[PDB]
Symmetry: C3
Subunit: 390 residues, 3 copies
């Protein structure tokens, strides 16, 4: 039969209002405020956390403030291990009410809510990003959200901690928590190496032309949304590659200019004409390496025939010192993918190359380069096949 | 007087929580999961559908699973007709409760919910996209959502079916169901015909340059959100025109390059200078033809003075073989409109034309062309006049 | 302890469901429909308003319709003043219920809701945009939303009124009320003045080239979202500057072309080569002037090291009559900031200038120029420091 959920004779249940709040949360779970570590009230037997509010699959969880310590987690038995401090909902447990709504004595012991320590494989098997209490095919009764990486030393010491920022809805994403900006940067200048194919460094360090003979590695302002992407964990790829943490249709915006761009000089032999040189800027995705995602989680496999390289700007140098470019594209990206930008041109400086033989400010370089990477759509259901290949 | 809805002494009603869920749904109705046809349990007297969940103007509807068939719809009396299988809310009916919340016997017969067959004019008169239970000026008591086109044959046969995907929130749009991407494509190459004005084919087939003498019609990956737009239903316009299904402020992104671009050769007569040739890429809207929208529904009339053509890229060829371009614009579009892209240049190849006299890969063509069309704003209330004209 | 809000044994409270509706509203408050002035039922002792619905920090407020006047506000004692007509929630008051749910006589006198007149300093001290009932650090018990600027004359006269459109969710923003388009325009042509640095007029009037000798100030279609931005209130800056009303990460899109662009003519002395001329289009922010925001409200101070100028397009003229450009950037903007676009080039027309010595259609000008400014992210919490500087 046809069942009404919100109708005149319907009884609105807890599962119902959680499903509504989850929808309003864009199916994202996370700490809405507070719930950060309290080192002052942290010992070698107890871990303390400040008061706050979180939403886990539509269920509102609160750590209440009083008098501090707002809450205490038992660390006895935990030594010489790296654990995950998790907030867990266990629907197998029973919430115990006491007193009465008539007197002013109603209270509940929420045994369905736990603050605990889990190892990485245990958390992954009950992580909200991968499993759901509300799931259609595999509904679960126990779900968790990791708050902190906790590294316990020898018995009698206080532990080391690292916030799992992907699980905190801190700021930048309020209103559209599952979408918005993934990565963005300020304008930067980067020297073009004398090679056919090279990546453009999008992670905060550029090889900035500083003099007529040299370029030097210089920081530039960059921002990343930890829920959507992260800097590659391997030092070889760290300057260039992003690891995508969330499946979706993303929008990539690029702009800048190619300064000291090479071209064949107009001479009597070529009928006093500029010999333009081909170059292209491409965006790329690579999924050959598994476990790049947070917690070394399993990558999401892309559909058959998925793109790997896409031309954002393809043209010839026009005989000017500096020539501007701009591009905007929507692309499919998968959890675990590597995402990066490449600069492609010929290697013969006297024939097909967009780059010259100069170094530093005398050499061909990218000037005023910037980008924005944003999540603009999901790949749930049919979209995975229809929209996921490009 | 001033009435509080959510206040301490207020009674939260069914209409109230439906209005809240509708707001959380971005005022969009549709199947959230399941509710697809079950051909195995479909006969010549009954139509079967799988279990699922839908939200119709804030009212949650569920088809419950048990033992299949999850639900059965009586098809007796339906023959040699094309009908719409609809999910209807009728607030004139009375939901009948039985048993008690005290025992574990409470049940409701939701007579306010129906699975029925309607003809196209009947559905349109009570379609959720055009009429509302919550409406300010014309509030309705009966509202429907079409799920399937059902074509019944002769008495004793099983019918033919077609899913109304615009009414299924399948994927790509979760989180922002009323907005997001309307249409997008992968990079493609398209030969420029030797005419003054031509449309660029945005519906999946391009006239791809394949040799030095020929171009051939080749498919390219394209995606459309059925709720926002569709391929033109008339074969003459099918390669080029989109039909907009939903009013709004849309964002159009284009990029690519013009390859083998024509120009006046630098000669002694012109002081050894490149004679650039003007061309422009425009986006366009046309509402002359009514009933192009889904179900042949009535178009939404645009305000007085509305734009029809807008220049996205206007410039001269620069003497290079290939020159890249990019553009991003926000435009107003109305339900029933035709939306398309045009390439405009002169017809005299020796004087004003951006195109040459070559064919295939030797002829002027668009290379690496792609676009994204996205809904970024609505045209409700005052916005219709203020923002709707451009 | 860990408290559950939405769990099986939990009691869902009024504050709870208001917090849920506020989240669903993207933390924006405003009139959802109606609540506009009723001049017909307005006297010299009373102000009338039409029926409608508003949401103030998750609390639903309704003015009920019956027989008009839908509601009356006492204006006795108000003379020779400019007041703000405000809708206030005061949680210190007590809502008085009467009758019973058993009979059909339940009614509430919502003393927690008021329609009143406040002076600008009083409203600012209890304005929903700046203070919250739900606030973590400074929770308030009284909060208001301004609906109209009301200017009372001499005793015995009807007042003058001005709608506070920023507090009305009229249209264009339904679905994403706190985000979406801030400002947009149709394509326009603007003459480039013979100076090093000039602003491009983004507020609806351009100096349009009309003849071979003259340009004239001509209107062009422009739209602004009052909640996000406004035209500068000072006449000196009115054609060029926007005042940002809301903190955030914004996206700026620009496109157009530079027509009649200057360049050094190819002559025997320069080896028959085009001497390109540098120019740049920049977007800018300035916060030196306080109180530019609505109600002369205090500006939001940007973090240390914040950007002020950013290059969107930087390149040389290429020897063509017309050369197109496009740019897309994400930038940080603060409540009270001035936002504007500048055109920068050299002043020596025979050496470094992108502009020539012509006027009107014979002079260098921007052609088909348009832009979109959109709010794409917030600057709450950590984002203020991490993302706010660029
Ligand atoms: O090209 P290879 O060695 O297969 O692949 C390597 O470079 C790619 C491109 O940066 C990375 O995405 C891969 O994770 C890495 O294994
Ligand atoms: O130019 P015509 O014949 O008025 O109009 C025709 O072409 C337009 C442009 O493709 C379409 O939008 C119209 O639906 C069609 O009737
Ligand atoms: O340059 P000045 O005089 O400091 O600053 C003036 O021009 C700026 C740029 O238009 C405005 O933002 C300022 O509000 C105004 O005071």
């Amino acid at each position: 039969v046809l069942k009404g959920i919100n109708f005149d004779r319907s009884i609105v249940t807890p599962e119902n209002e959680a499903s509504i709040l989850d929808l309003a949360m864009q199916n994202r779970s996370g700490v809405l405020d507070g719930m950060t570590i309290d080192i002052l009230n942290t010992t070698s037997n107890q871990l303390a956390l400040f008061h706050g509010t979180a939403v886990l699959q539509g269920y509102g969880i609160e750590i209440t403030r009083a008098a501090a310590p707002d809450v205490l987690v038992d660390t006895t038995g935990q030594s010489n291990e790296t654990m995950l401090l998790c907030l867990t909902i266990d629907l197998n447990q029973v919430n115990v009410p006491s007193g009465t709504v008539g007197t002013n004595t109603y209270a509940v012991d929420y045994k369905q809510i736990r603050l605990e320590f889990l190892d990485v494989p245990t958390l992954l098997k009950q992580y909200w990003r991968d499993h759901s209490l509300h799931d259609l095919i595999d509904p679960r009764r126990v779900i968790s959200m990791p708050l902190y990486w906790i590294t316990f030393g020898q018995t009698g010491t206080t532990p080391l901690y690292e916030q799992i920022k992907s699980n905190y809805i801190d700021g930048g994403n309020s209103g559209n928590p599952a979408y918005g900006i993934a990565a963005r940067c300020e304008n930067f200048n980067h020297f073009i190496n004398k090679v056919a194919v090279q990546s453009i460094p999008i992670n905060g360090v550029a090889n900035r032309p500083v003099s007529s003979t040299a370029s030097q590695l210089t920081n530039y302002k960059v921002w990343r949304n930890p829920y959507l992407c992260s800097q590659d964990p391997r030092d070889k790829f760290a300057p260039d590659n992003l690891v995508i943490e969330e499946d979706g249709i993303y929008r990539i915006d690029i702009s800048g200019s190619i300064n000291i761009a090479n071209y064949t000089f107009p001479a009597s032999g070529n009928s006093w004409r500029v010999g333009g040189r081909y170059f292209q800027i491409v965006c790329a995705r690579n999924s050959s390496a598994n476990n790049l995602a947070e917690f070394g989680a399993e990558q999401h496999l892309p559909p058959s025939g998925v793109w790997t390289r896409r031309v954002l700007v393809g043209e010839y140098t026009a005989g000017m010192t500096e020539q501007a470019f701009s591009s905007v594209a929507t692309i499919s990206l998968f959890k675990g993918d590597n995402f990066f930008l490449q600069f492609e041109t010929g290697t013969n400086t006297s024939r097909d190359s967009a780059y010259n033989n100069g170094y530093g400010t005398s050499g061909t370089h990218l000037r005023n380069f910037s980008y924005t990477l944003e999540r603009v759509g999901d790949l749930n259901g049919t979209a995975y096949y229809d929209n996921g290949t490009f």
